[PDB]
Amino acid sequence: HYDDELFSDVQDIKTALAKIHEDNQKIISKLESLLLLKGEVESIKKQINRQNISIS
Amino acid sequence: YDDELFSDVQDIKTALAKIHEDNQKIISKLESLLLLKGEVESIKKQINRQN
Amino acid sequence: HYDDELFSDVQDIKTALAKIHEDNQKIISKLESLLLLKGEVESIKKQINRQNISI
Amino acid sequence: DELFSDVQDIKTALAKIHEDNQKIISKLESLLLLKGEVESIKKQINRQN
């Protein structure tokens, strides 16, 4: 059959998987947030290149 | 193979599959983020020349 | 009922999930630490625009 | 029998996830080094001012 302790173990696996999934959704959105650094860093690089055009 | 156990196992399978795919998405986003190292290194270099 | 070897397999599965959960917590805090880069990068941008008004 | 096969596939999937996790942590540790670097850049921008 479906033994009670096996059942219990399965429930805890369910809980843990569910925690893992939601943590992954946090991970992903933090990453989406961090990826915005690429353009910003690119802008700094661009500004530093206009700045280095300082024939003074 | 109890039907309910069976159902539970399939649900675990779905969750694992989803987790795995999220992992590949995370890795790729990370591979992209890693390109920042060279860019930041480059800015540092430009800033030192600028000095 | 709950067969000995299935039982052994379930415990190993439990061990792996625990480890995975843990690595996730460490991953999350590393990410929270990296997110501070946003403000810092923003400051740099600002202090460089300030510099550009060098004329 | 079929449950056995399912458990093996779960074990496979778990191992893969775990290993991606080690690759993720390592990429992250490398990314963490960016903290000192932009701190330096920040410092050299202040000195430039």
Textual characterization of the structure:
- Four copies of one chain form a homotetramer.
- Chain A has 56 residues and is mainly alpha-helical.
- Chain A has one domain.
- Helices cover 86% and strands 0% of the residues of chain A.
- The first copy, chain A, contains two helices and no strands.
- The first copy, chain A, has helices at residues 4-35, 37-52.
- The longest helix of chain A is centred in the middle third of the chain and has 32 residues, at 4-35.
- The radius of gyration of chain A is 25 Å and the shape is rod-shaped.
- The N and C termini of chain A lie far apart (86 Å).
- The relative contact order of chain A is 0.06.
- Chains B and D meet through helix 1 and helix 2 of B and helix 1 and helix 2 of D.
Care to give the gist of this entry?
Four copies of one chain form a homotetramer. Helices cover about 85% and strands about 0% of the residues of chain A.
Summarize this structure as a short list of keywords or feature phrases:
homotetramer; rod-shaped
| Protein chains sharing the most extensive interface | A-C, 30 and 30 residues
**Rg of chain A (CA only):** 25 Å
Count of discrete domains of chain A: 1
As an assembly, this protein is: homotetramer
| Helix residue percentage of chain A | over 70%
Region (Multimerization) (chain A): 1-56
Family (chain A): Belongs to the morbillivirus P protein family.
Protein name (chain A): Phosphoprotein
PDB class: viral protein
